[PDB]
Design brief:
The structure is cut from a larger assembly and holds 9 protein chains of 9 kinds.
Chain B (H helix, E strand, L loop, with lengths): L20 H6 L1 H7 L1 H14 L6 H21 L1 H13 L9 H14 L1
Helix pairs in contact in B: 3-4, 5-6
Chain D lengths: L2 H18 L5 H25 L8 H27 L13
Helix pairs in contact in D: 1-2, 2-3
Chain I lengths: L4 H5 L23 H11 L4 H7 L1 H12 L1 H19 L18
Helix pairs in contact in I: 2-4
The chains are: A mainly alpha (318), B mainly alpha (114), C mainly alpha (175), D mainly alpha (98), E mainly alpha (83), F mainly alpha (347), G mainly alpha (70), H mainly alpha (115), I mainly alpha (105).
The structure holds cardiolipin (2 copies), Coenzyme Q10, (2Z,6E,10Z,14E,18E,22E,26Z)-isomer, the ligand CCCCCCCCCCCCCCCCC[C@@H](O)O[C@H](CO[C@H](O)CCCCCCCCCCCCCCC)COP(=O)(O)OCC[N+](C)(C)C (2 copies) and 1,2-dioleoyl-sn-glycero-3-phosphoethanolamine (PEE) (4 copies).
Chain lengths: 318, 114, 175, 98, 83, 347, 70, 115, 105
C-alpha cells in the first residue's frame, strides 16, 4: 500500500514533466508571436507522447572513446535523484516524514551535480568536458549562498521539518517577512536548475550541446526528464517555503489545489524568464553570487538571527 | 557477583489503564490536577531510590488513582468527553489547538458536575 | 543478525575504501569516496545521528566536486586507470576485498582477536539503550550546545578558518 | 566490539595503508587522507551516539572543520607542485635528499 | 563630518549592495543590546518544561515551594499570556 | 609576504603550540597540532624557490599522517574508556599508536627521513623555527603520558635516533643537513630519559634549544649554508668563527661546556634505574656527533682556507641588523655547567 | 490565441494534483481514516507503541475509549 | 525502511528505462558513427589532456566556506538555550569572521580569475 | 609541558567536556552516569598509582557498562544452549517468546 503511494507520486510527476515541455513550447511561442505545437493532437496535447515514443525508438549511441560504466550510470543517477527529491514534500502530507527534510533536499541536490560531471567526463569529448567544468564552477558559485539563505529563512520555522512550514505561515506568507531573501533564493534556484539566464552547462549557442552532446535517444530523454522534474520540484519547494497555503486537516485537497496553483505560477515564471533575458557569462555568474549575493546574505543571516531574540519571536521547536 | 533480585509475576499484576493516547491527552490537564499527590509520591520515590523494584506499591496507587479519575468522568459526562478526545484523535499530531469548542464543552461539564 | 542492514552498510563502506585506496584515476577514486560517504551517512542514520550523517554527506559531496575539478586540471593522465586497467590497481583491489572477507569470516562464525579485542557478531542491535523519554533530539541538543558550552571551540575553529583563507592565499601567490 | 566497529577500524587501516603506499598521482594520496578523516568521523560518531554523551555530539563537526583546512592546504600545495612540473607526480619531488 | 558624508555618497553611488549589507549587519550587531524584549525571550526559553519537574521532599520549612500545582506559590506565567 | 601576515602566522604557530601546552582535553590538543601545522606551512614557503615547495609538501604529508594516527589513538582510548582527559592512556594499542604519531611528529628514527630534506629545502630562519619551536608541543604531550609509555618501544626509537643522527651527520657537507642530523640525535637523547624522569627531558630540551639558537644565529650572521662557504668567514669575521668553534665543541658534549650537562644528567638518572648498557651505548655513539662537529671546526676556525679577491670589498661593510639575544645565547650555551643544581627548579 | 496554452496547463495541473490527494487518501485508508500519526520524537513513538499494545489487535489506530474501565 | 524502498524503486525505474532504450531499437553501429564529435572535423588532441582551472583559488576557498555552513546549520536549535546573550555573541562572531575572510580574499584580488 | 592556566585562573576552557557526568544540556544523562560517577568519586585525590589498584572494581564496572562484553558473552552462552536444546528437541520455548503474548500497557 506504500508501493501504491510511491507509484502515485512517480507516474504523475513524469506526466507533468512530459506536459511541461509542451507548455514551455507554447508559452515561448506565444511570447515570440507564434503558436507552437498545435498539430500533433488538439492544441498539441499529443506532442509530448510523440516526442517520448520517438526518443525511445531511436538508436542509442555509445561513443568509441567513452567510458561506458559512467556514461550509462550518469543518466540513471540524474533521473532517480530527480524522482527522489519529491518524497519529503508535504502536499500537505509527505510520503516520507523527515525531521530534517530541508537538509535531505540540500544533500540530494548536491549529489545531483555528479550526473552532469560524470556524463561530461565519460563522454570523452571536448564540448562535454567544457560543460562539466562549467557545472563545477556553477556549483561553487551558488552552493554557499543557497545554504545560508535557507538557514536564514528557516530561523522563523524553528526546525528543518517541511510540514512545520505550513504551521509557520498560517496567517501570513513568509515572503512578506523575507522578500530580500526570497529574491536571492529565486535567482539561486535558477542557477541551481541550470536554467536561463544561467544555463551554462548546456550552453547551446556557445557549446552546441554542452555536457550531453554525445547523448542520443533514451539516455538523452532521461536527462531531459530529470531537468524538468527538477524545475517543478524546486518551484514546489519555493512555493512551500515562501507562499504557504492554509491547510484544513479535514479537507486537505484545498491545500493541494492551492499549492499546485502556486507551483504552476512559479514554473511559468521560470519559462517567462527564459524568453526575456540573454545568457550570463559563467565567471560573471560566479562574481554575481560571490560579490553581491554573499555579503547581503551574510548580513541578512545576522539580522534574522538577531531579530527573534530582539522582539521575543523565537519559534517553538527545540 | 551475585543474583539479581526480581519481583514475582504476581507482584507486577495491576488493573491496567487501557485508554488510548488521545484519550489520555484529552484528560491530561484535569488528571494532573486531580491525581497529583500519588503521582508526586511515586516520582519522588522513583528519583530517590533509583530502582524500579523499590517503588512498585506507589505505581499501583498511581494506577488506582487514574482508574478513580476515569471512573468519575464516565459516571458524570462520558458524552462530552468522548466528543473531545475523538476530535483530538483525528489530528496526526493530536493538537489541542484544533478542538477548542469540544474542550470548552468538556470543561464546562466537569466544572459543575465535579 | 536481523536484516543484516548495518553489517551490509559497513561492508559497502569498507569496499568503497578499498576502491579509492587502490589509487586508480582520481575521477574513479572520487566516486569511491562518494559511495563511502553516502553509506557512512546511512550507518550513522541507523544509530540516531540524522544530522551528523547528512552533514558529513553534504560536506564530502562538495569536497569531491572540488577534487573532480582539480583532477581534470592537474591529474589527468591521458589513459586514466580503472580498477581492471592495470595489474597493480587490480591486485590492490583484490587484496583489499580478500582481506576484508577473511577478517569478516574469522570474526563471524568463530570469535577471533585481531589487534585490540574480539567479536562474536550478535548484530549491532544488542548494545542499544532502551531509554524512553523526550520531546527533543538528543543529538540536536548536543550539537546546538556548541554555542553555549563550546565558546572556546567556536573561537579556535573560527580563527583556524580565517587563518586557512590567509594561508591558502599565501601559498598559491608564487612570485 | 561489534562487527561495525571493526569494519570502521578496518576502513581506517585500509586508508592509512593507501596513504603510505604511493603510486604516482599526489591527488590519489590526498584522497586517502580524506578517507582517513571520514573513517574517524564515523567511528567517533558511533561511539558518541552509543554512550549518549550529549556534549561530545559537537566534536565530530569540529573534526570535520579541520578536515577541510587540511584538504584545502594539500590542494594548495598540489597547485604549486603542478605549476613547477606540469604534473602532480611525486617522482618530481626529489630535489632534496637524505 | 564632511569626509564621511562624501565617502557614503560615493559608496551609495558605486556599491549600494555593500552599503546595504554593512548597514544591516551593523543593525543586527547593535540593536539586540538596546532592546527590552531580549530579556523576555530568555524568560520564555526558561519557561519551556522540556523535562519532568522532580518533586522535593517536604522538610517542613519550605514555605515558597507549592504543595499542589494550583497553589499560589511558585513561578507564574501570567506575564506570558498577556504578551 | 607582507610583514603583518608573517607576524600573524608566527603568532598562530605559537598559539597552536600553547594550545597544546595548556589543554586538558585531547580534542583541544589535536586542534592545537592542526592549527600549528596550518600556519607552519606558509612560513616554510616564504621564499618561493621550488625546493621550498618540495620541503613544505613533504612536511605537510608527514605531519598530516601523524595527526591522523594521533586522532585514531584518541578515539580508541575514548572507545575503551569514556575519557577525554590527557592521562595514562587506558588502552595499550592506543598508546602504541599515540607514541608512533608523536615520534613521527618529532622525527625520531625510523620516522626521521623528512628532517634533513625539509631543513635543507627551507631557509635558515625557517630551519631555526622548525628545529627549535616545533619540538615543544609533542614533547609536552609525551611528558604528560610518560607513565603509560612502553619503555621498550620508546627506548628502541631513542637508540635508533642517536645511531642514525650520528651516522647521517658524517656524510654531510651542507650545514642544514648537519643541523638536522644533530637534531635527530638530540631528540633521541631527550626521549631516552623520558620514561624515567621528565625533568631531565625538559633540561635537555632547554640546553639543546639554546645551543641550536646560537648555532643558527651564527650561521645567519655569516650567510653560510655550506662548509666551503663557511670556510671563508675567518677572513671576514674571525670572532664569529671563534664563537662557532666553541659552540660546536659544546654541542659535542665535552666538559666543562654546557652541552655536557644533559648527557651527564641523563646517564646518572639511568644508572639509578639499573640501566647501565643503554647509557654506555648512547655515550659512545655520541662520539659520531662530536666527530662531525670537529670536522666543521677544522674547516672554519682551526685552519685557514683560501679566500677570494672580492672578499676585499666585503671588508668595507658592517653587519647591519644585529641579533640582540645572540651574545646571551652563546654564553648560555657554553658557560653554564657550574649552575647545574638549578635544574631542581624545573620540577 | 493565448488561451490555447491553457489545455496543457490544465493537464499538468491535473497530473500535479494526484500525488498529494493520493497520499492523503492512502494515509486515511491505512490509518483508520483518522489521519496518519506523526512521530518526530521518541515520546510520540512511545505513545504509538502503547496504543498498539493496548489496542488488542496490534493496530495503533484502533482507539480504546472509556469503555475499557469496567 | 520506506526510504530504502523508495530509492530502490527510483533506481529500478531509471535502469529499466535505460535497458528499454538500449534493447528496443535497431542498432547499426559503425566506426564513423561512433567517432567523437567536434563539429564535423576530427579532434586535434585528446579530451583527456589537462584543462586549466582559472578559478582554482575560489574552488579551494569554497571548501572552507562550505564547512562554515556546517557550523551555522544548528543555529535554529541554539536559539532555544537560556544563555541567549552568549549564544548570539558566538553566532555573530562566526559570521563576522566569515565576512572578514571574504573581505580579505576580495581586497587581495583573490576572487579574480587567472588569465 | 602542561601549564595549568585553567586551574590558575579558574577559566574552564575545556573541562566541561572531559567527562560524561558533567552538566549536560537539559540534564540528559550518559548511558553510564552512575558508574563513571562512582569511579571518579572513589579515585578522587588518591593519585594515579593508588587509584589503578584500589578503584579497579569501579573501573571494571564502568568498562562493563561501556562495552558490555560480559553481557554479550552471557547472552551468547544462553542462546547457544537454547539452540542446542531445541535442535534435538526438548525445550519448546513458551508462547510469549514466539509472539503469542498478551501485551501490557
Ligand atoms: C565488491 C566488488 C564490486 C563489484 C561491482 C560489479 C562487478 C564489476 C563489473 C560491473 C561494473 C562494470 C561493468 C562493466 O565494466 O561492463 C562493461 C561492458 C563491456 O565493456 P567493453 O566496452 O567491452 O569495455 C570497455 C572498457 O572496459 C572500459 O570500461 P570502463 O572504463 O567504463 O569500466 C569501468 C568499470 C570497470 O569495472 C572495474 O573496473 C572493476 C569493478 C570495480 C568497481 C568497484 C569499485 C569501488 C566502487 C565503490 C563500491 C560500490 C559498491 C559495490 C558493492 C555493492 C554491494 C551490494 O568500473 C566502474 O566504473 C564501476 C562503477 C560502478 C560504481 C557504482 C557507483 C554508483 C555511484 C552513485 C552515486 C553515489 C550514491 C550514494 C552512495 O559494458 C556494458 O556491459 C554496458 C554498461 C555496463 C555498465 C552498467 C552500469 C554498471 C553496472 C553496475 C555496477 C554497480 C552499480 C551499483
Ligand atoms: C620551562 C620554562 C622555559 C620554557 C621555554 C620555552 C621555549 C623557549 C624558546 C623556544 C625556542 C624559541 C624559538 C623562536 C623562533 C622564532 C623564529 C623567528 O622569529 O625568527 C628568528 C629571527 C630571524 O630574524 P631575521 O631573519 O634577521 O629578520 C628578518 C625577518 O624575519 C623578515 O621578516 P618580515 O620582513 O616579515 O619581518 C616581520 C617582523 C617584524 O615585526 C613587526 O613588524 C610587528 C608587526 C605587528 C603586526 C601585528 C599583527 C597582529 C594580528 C595577528 C594576531 C594573531 C593572533 C594569533 C592568536 C590566535 C589565538 C586563537 O616580525 C618577525 O620577525 C617575527 C614576529 C614574531 C611575533 C611573535 C608572536 C608571538 C605569539 C605568541 C603566541 C602565544 C599567545 C598565547 C596563546 C594562548 C593559547 C591560545 O630572529 C630571532 O628570533 C632570534 C631568535 C629569538 C629567540 C628568542 C629567545 C627565546 C626566548 C627568550 C625570551 C624569554 C622566553 C621565555 C618567556 C617566559 C614566559 C614569560
Ligand atoms: C529555441 O529553440 C528551442 C525550443 O523552441 C522550439 C525548445 O523548445 C527546446 C526544448 C526542447 C523541446 C523540443 C522539447 C522536447 C520534448 C522532450 C525531449 C520530450 C520528453 C517527454 C518524455 C521523455 C517524458 C516521458 C513520457 C511519458 C508519457 C511520461 C510518463 C512516464 C511513464 C513511465 C508513465 C530547445 C532545447 C530549443 O532549443
Ligand atoms: C516502463 C518501465 C517498465 C517496463 C515494463 C516492461 C519491461 C520490458 C523489458 C525491457 C527490454 C525491452 C526489449 C524489447 C525487445 C526484445 C530484445 C531482446 O530481449 O530480444 C532478443 C532476445 O533473444 C536473444 O536472441 C536470445 C534468445 C535465446 C537465448 C537466451 C534466452 C533463454 C530463454 C529461453 C526462451 C525459450 C522460451 C521461453 C518461454 C518462457 C534479443 O534480440 P537482439 O537482436 O539482440 O536485440 C534487438 C531487439 N530488436 C531486434 C527488437 C531491435
Ligand atoms: C587571559 C587572556 C587575555 C589576553 C590573551 C587573549 C588570548 C585568548 C583569546 C580570547 C579569550 C576568550 C576565551 C575565554 C573563554 C570563554 C568561556 C567563558 O569566558 O565564558 C563564556 C563567555 O563568553 C562570552 O560570549 C564572552 C567571551 C567571548 C569573546 C568573543 C570572541 C573574541 C575572541 C578574539 C580572540 C581569539 C583569536 C582571534 C579571533 C578574532 C561563556 O560562559 P557562560 O555562557 O556564561 O556559561 C557557560 C556555562 N554553562 C553553559 C553551564 C551555563
Ligand atoms: C530486454 C532484454 C533483457 C536483456 C538484458 C541485457 C542487459 C545488459 O547488460 O546488456 C547491455 C545493454 C544492451 O547493450 P547492447 O548489447 O549494445 O544492445 C543490445 C541490443 N541487441 O545495454 C544497456 O542497456 C544497459 C542497461 C543498464 C543496466 C541496468 C542496471 C544499472 C544499475 C544502475 C545502478 C546505479 C544507479 C545510480 C543512481 C542510484 C543512486 C541512488
Ligand atoms: C545515498 C544517501 C541517502 C540518504 C538517506 C537519508 C534519508 C533520511 O534522512 O531519512 C531519515 C530516516 C528517518 O529519520 P528522521 O525522520 O530524521 O528521524 C527519525 C524519527 N522518525 O532515517 C532512516 O530511515 C534511515 C534508514 C537507512 C538509511 C538509508 C541508507 C541508504 C544507503 C544507500 C546504499 C545503496 C547501495 C550502496 C551503494 C549505492 C550505489 C552503488
Ligand atoms: C518512456 C516512454 C516511452 C517508452 C517506450 C515504449 C515504446 C512502446 C512502443 C514500441 C513500438 C514497437 C517497437 C518497434 C521499433 C523497434 C526497432 C525497429 O523498428 O526495428 C525493426 C526491425 C527491422 O529489422 P529487420 O526487418 O529484421 O532487418 C533490418 C536490418 N537491415 O524489426 C523488428 O525487430 C521488430 C520486432 C518487433 C518489435 C517489438 C515491439 C513490441 C512492443 C515493445 C514494448 C516495449 C515494452 C518494454
Ligand atoms: C558592524 C557590522 C559589520 C559586519 C556586518 C556586515 C555583514 C557582511 C557585509 C560585508 C561582507 C564582506 C564585504 C567585503 C568588502 C569588499 C571590499 C572591496 O573590495 O570593495 C571594493 C569597492 O570598494 C568598496 O569597498 C565599496 C565602498 C566601501 C564599502 C561599502 C560601504 C562601507 C559601509 C557603508 C555603510 C555604513 C552604514 C550606513 C550609513 C548610512 C548613512 C547615514 C570592491 O569593488 P571592486 O571589486 O574592486 O570593483 C571592480 C569593478 N568596478
Amino acid at each position: 500500500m506504500f508501493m501504491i503511494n510511491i507509484l502515485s507520486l512517480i507516474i504523475p510527476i513524469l506526466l507533468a514533466v512530459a506536459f511541461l515541455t509542451l507548455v514551455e513550447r507554447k508559452v515561448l511561442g506565444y511570447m515570440q508571436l507564434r503558436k507552437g505545437p498545435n498539430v500533433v493532437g488538439p492544441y498539441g496535447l499529443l506532442q509530448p507522447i510523440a516526442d517520448a515514443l520517438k526518443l525511445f525508438t531511436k538508436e542509442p549511441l555509445r561513443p568509441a572513446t567513452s567510458s561506458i560504466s559512467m556514461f550509462i550510470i550518469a543518466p540513471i543517477l540524474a533521473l532517480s535523484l530527480a524522482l527522489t527529491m519529491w518524497v519529503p514534500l508535504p502536499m500537505p502530507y509527505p510520503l516520507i516524514n523527515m525531521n530534517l527534510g530541508v537538509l535531505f533536499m540540500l544533500a540530494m541536490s548536491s549529489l545531483a551535480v555528479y550526473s552532469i560531471l560524470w556524463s561530461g567526463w565519460a563522454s570523452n569529448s571536448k564540448y562535454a568536458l567544457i560543460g562539466a567544468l562549467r557545472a563545477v564552477a556553477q556549483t561553487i558559485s551558488y552552493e554557499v549562498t543557497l545554504a545560508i539563505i535557507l538557514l536564514s529563512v528557516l530561523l522563523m520555522n524553528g526546525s528543518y521539518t517541511l510540514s512545520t512550514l505550513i504551521t509557520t505561515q498560517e496567517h501570513i506568507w513568509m515572503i512578506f517577512t523575507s522578500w530580500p531573501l526570497a529574491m536571492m533564493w529565486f535567482i539561486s534556484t535558477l542557477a541551481e536548475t541550470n536554467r536561463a539566464p544561467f544555463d551554462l552547462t548546456e550552453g547551446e549557442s556557445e557549446l552546441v550541446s554542452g555536457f550531453n552532446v554525445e547523448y542520443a535517444a533514451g539516455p538523452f530523454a532521461m536527462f531531459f526528464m530529470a531537468e524538468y522534474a527538477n524545475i517543478i520540484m524546486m518551484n514546489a519547494f519555493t512555493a512551500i517555503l515562501f507562499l504557504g497555503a492554509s491547510h484544513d486537516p479535514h479537507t486537505p485537497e484545498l491545500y493541494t489545489i492551492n499549492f499546485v496553483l502556486k507551483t504552476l505560477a512559479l514554473t511559468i515564471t521560470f519559462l517567462w524568464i527564459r524568453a526575456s533575458y540573454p545568457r550570463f557569462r559563467y565567471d560573471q555568474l560566479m562574481h554575481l553570487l560571490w560579490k553581491s549575493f554573499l555579503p547581503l546574505t551574510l548580513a541578512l543571516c545576522m539580522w534574522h538571527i538577531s531579530l527573534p531574540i530582539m522582539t521575543a519571536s523565537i519559534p517553538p521547536q527545540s | 557477583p551475585g543474583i539479581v533480585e526480581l519481583p514475582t509475576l504476581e507482584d507486577l499484576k495491576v488493573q491496567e489503564v487501557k485508554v488510548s493516547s488521545s484519550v489520555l491527552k484529552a484528560a491530561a490537564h484535569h488528571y494532573g490536577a486531580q491525581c497529583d499527590k500519588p503521582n508526586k509520591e511515586f516520582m519522588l520515590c522513583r528519583w530517590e531510590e533509583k530502582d524500579p523494584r523499590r517503588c512498585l506499591e506507589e505505581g499501583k496507587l498511581v494506577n488506582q488513582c487514574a482508574l478513580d479519575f476515569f471512573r468519575q468522568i464516565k459516571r458524570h459526562c462520558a458524552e462530552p468527553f468522548t466528543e473531545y478526545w475523538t476530535c483530538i484523535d483525528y489530528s496526526g499530531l493530536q493538537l489541542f489547538r484544533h478542538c477548542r469548542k469540544q474542550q470548552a464543552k468538556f470543561d464546562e461539564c466537569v466544572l459543575d458536575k465535579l | 543478525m536481523t536484516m543484516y542492514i548495518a553489517f551490509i552498510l559497513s561492508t559497502i563502506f569498507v569496499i568503497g575504501f578499498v576502491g579509492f585506496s587502490s589509487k586508480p584515476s582520481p575521477i574513479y577514486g572520487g566516486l569511491g569516496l562518494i559511495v563511502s560517504g553516502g553509506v557512512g551517512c546511512g550507518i550513522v542514520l541507523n544509530f540516531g545521528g540524522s544530522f551528523l550523517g547528512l552533514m558529513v554527506f553534504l560536506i564530502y559531496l562538495g569536497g569531491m566536486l572540488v577534487v573532480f575539478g582539480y583532477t581534470t586540471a592537474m591529474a589527468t593522465e591521458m589513459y586514466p586507470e580503472v580498477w581492471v586497467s592495470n595489474k597493480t590497481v587490480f591486485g590492490a583491489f583484490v587484496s583489499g576485498l580478500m582481506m576484508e572477507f577473511c577478517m569478516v569470516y574469522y570474526a563471524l562464525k568463530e570469535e577471533e582477536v585481531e589487534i585490540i579485542f574480539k567479536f562474536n557478531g550478535l548484530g549491532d542491535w544488542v548494545i542499544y539503550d532502551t531509554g524512553d523519554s523526550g520531546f527533543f533530539s538528543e543529538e540536536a541538543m548536543g550539537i546546538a550546545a556548541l554555542y553555549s558550552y563550546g565558546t572556546w571551540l567556536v573561537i579556535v575553529t573560527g580563527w583556524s578558518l580565517l587563518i586557512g583563507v590567509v594561508v591558502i592565499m599565501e601559498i598559491t601567490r608564487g612570485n | 566490539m561489534p562487527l561495525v566497529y571493526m569494519n570502521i577500524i578496518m576502513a581506517f587501516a585500509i586508508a592509512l595503508a593507501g596513504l603510505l603506499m604511493y603510486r604516482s598521482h599526489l591527488m590519489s594520496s590526498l584522497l586517502c587522507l580524506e578517507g582517513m578523516m571520514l573513517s574517524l568521523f564515523i567511528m567517533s560518531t558511533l561511539i558518541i551516539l552509543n554512550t549518549h554523551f550529549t556534549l561530545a555530539n559537537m566534536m565530530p563537526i569540529i573534526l570535520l572543520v579541520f578536515a577541510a583546512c587540511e584538504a584545502a592546504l594539500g590542494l594548495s600545495l598540489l597547485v604549486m607542485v603542478s605549476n613547477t612540473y606540469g604534473t602532480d607526480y611525486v617522482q618530481n619531488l626529489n630535489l632534496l635528499q637524505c | 563630518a564632511g569626509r564621511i558624508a562624501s565617502f557614503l555618497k560615493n559608496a551609495w553611488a558605486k556599491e549600494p549592495v555593500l552599503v546595504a549589507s554593512f548597514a544591516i549587519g551593523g543593525l543586527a550587531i547593535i540593536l539586540p543590546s538596546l532592546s527590552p524584549y531580549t530579556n523576555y525571550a530568555i524568560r520564555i526559553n526558561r519557561a519551556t518544561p522540556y523535562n519532568y519537574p522532580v518533586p522535593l521532599r517536604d522538610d517542613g520549612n519550605m514555605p515558597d515551594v507549592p504543595s499542589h500545582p494550583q497553589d499560589p506559590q511558585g513561578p507564574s506565567l501570567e506575564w506570558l499570556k498577556n504578551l | 609576504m607582507n610583514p603583518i601576515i608573517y607576524t600573524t602566522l608566527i603568532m598562530t604557530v605559537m598559539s597552536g603550540t600553547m594550545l597544546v601546552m595548556i589543554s586538558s582535553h585531547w580534542l583541544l590538543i589535536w586542534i592545537g597540532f592542526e592549527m600549528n601545522l596550518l600556519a607552519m606551512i606558509p612560513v616554510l614557503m616564504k621564499n618561493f624557490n621550488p625546493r621550498a615547495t618540495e620541503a613544505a609538501t613533504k612536511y605537510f604529508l608527514t605531519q598530516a599522517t601523524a595527526s591522523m594516527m594521533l586522532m585514531m589513538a584518541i578515539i580508541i582510548n575514548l572507545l575503551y574508556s569514556g575519557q577525554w582527559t590527557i592521562t595514562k592512556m587506558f588502552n595499550p594499542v592506543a598508546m602504541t599508536m599515540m607514541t608512533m604519531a608523536l615520534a613521527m611528529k618529532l622525527g625520531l628514527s625510523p620516522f626521521h627521513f623528512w628532517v634533513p630534506e625539509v631543513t635543507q629545502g627551507i631557509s635558515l630562519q625557517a630551519g631555526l623555527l622548525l628545529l627549535t619551536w616545533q619540538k615543544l608541543a609533542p614533547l609536552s604531550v609525551l611528558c604528560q603520558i610518560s607513565q603509560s609509555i612502553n619503555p621498550n618501544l620508546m627506548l628502541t626509537m631513542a637508540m635508533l635516533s642517536i645511531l642514525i643522527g650520528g651516522w647521517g651527520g658524517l656524510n654531510q657537507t651542507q650545514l642544514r643537513k648537519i643541523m638536522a642530523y644533530s637534531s635527530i640525535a638530540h631528540m633521541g637523547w631527550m626521549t631516552a630519559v623520558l620514561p624515567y624522569n621528565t625533568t631531565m627531558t625538559i633540561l635537555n630540551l632547554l640546553i639543546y634549544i639554546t645551543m641550536t639558537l646560537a648555532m643558527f644565529m651564527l650561521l645567519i650572521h655569516s650567510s653560510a649554508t655550506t662548509t666551503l662557504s663557511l670556510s671563508h668567514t675567518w677572513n671576514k669575521m674571525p670572532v664569529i668563527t671563534s664563537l662557532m668553534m666553541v659552540t660546536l665543541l659544546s654541542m659535542g658534549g665535552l666538559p666543562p661546556l654546557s652541552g655536557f650537562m644533559p648527557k651527564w644528567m641523563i646517564i646518572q638518572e639511568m644508572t639509578k634505574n639499573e640501566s647501565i648498557i643503554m647509557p654506555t651505548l648512547m655515550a659512545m655513539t655520541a662520539l659520531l656527533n662530536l666527530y662531525f662537529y670537529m670536522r666543521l671546526a677544522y674547516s672554519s676556525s682551526l685552519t685557514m682556507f683560501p679566500s677570494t679577491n672580492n672578499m676585499k670589498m666585503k671588508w668595507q661593510f658592517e653587519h647591519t641588523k644585529q641579533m640582540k639575544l645572540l651574545p646571551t645565547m652563546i654564553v648560555l650555551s657554553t658557560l653554564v655547567l657550574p649552575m647545574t643544581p638549578a635544574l631542581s627548579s624545573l620540577n | 490565441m493565448w488561451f490555447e496554452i491553457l489545455p496543457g496547463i490544465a493537464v499538468m495541473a491535473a497530473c500535479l494534483f494526484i500525488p498529494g490527494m493520493a497520499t492523503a487518501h492512502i494515509h486515511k485508508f491505512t490509518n483508520g481514516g483518522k489521519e496518519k500519526r506523526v512521530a518526530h520524537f521518541s515520546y510520540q513513538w512511545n505513545l504509538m507503541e502503547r496504543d498498539r499494545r493496548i489496542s488488542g489487535v496490534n493496530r495503533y489506530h484502533v482507539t480504546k475509549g472509556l469503555e475499557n474501565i469496567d | 525502511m520506506n526510504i530504502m524502498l523508495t530509492l530502490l524503486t527510483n533506481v529500478t525505474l531509471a535502469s529499466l528505462l535505460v535497458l528499454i532504450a538500449f534493447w528496443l531499437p535497431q542498432l547499426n553501429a559503425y566506426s564513423e558513427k561512433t567517432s567523437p564529435y567536434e563539429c564535423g572535423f576530427d579532434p586535434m588532441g585528446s579530451a583527456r589532456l589537462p584543462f586549466s582551472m582559472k578559478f582554482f583559488l575560489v574552488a579551494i576557498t569554497f571548501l572552507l566556506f562550505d564547512l562554515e555552513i556546517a557550523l551555522l546549520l544548528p543555529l535554529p536549535w541554539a536559539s532555544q538555550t537560556n544563555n541567549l546573550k552568549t549564544m548570539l555573541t558566538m553566532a555573530l562572531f562566526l559570521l563576522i569572521l566569515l565576512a572578514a575572510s571574504l573581505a580579505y580574499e576580495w581586497t587581495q584580488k583573490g576572487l579574480e580569475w587567472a588569465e | 609541558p602542561f601549564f595549568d592556566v585553567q586551574k590558575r585562573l579558574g577559566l574552564d576552557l575545556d573541562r566541561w567536556m572531559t567527562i560524561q557526568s558533567a552538566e549536560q544540556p537539559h540534564k540528559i544523562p550518559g548511558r553510564c552516569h552512575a558508574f563513571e560517577k562512582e569511579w571518579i568519586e572513589c579515585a578522587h585525590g588518591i593519585g594515579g598509582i593508588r587509584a589503578e589498584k584500589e578503584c579497579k572494581i569501579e573501573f571494571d564496572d564502568f568498562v562493563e557498562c561501556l562495552l558490555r562484553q560480559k553481557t554479550m558473552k552471557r547472552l551468547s552462552a544462553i542462546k547457544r544452549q537454547r539452540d542446542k536444546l531445541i535442535k534435538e528437541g526438548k525445550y519448546t520455548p513458551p508462547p510469549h517468546h514466539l509472539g503469542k503474548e498478551d501485551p501490557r500497557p
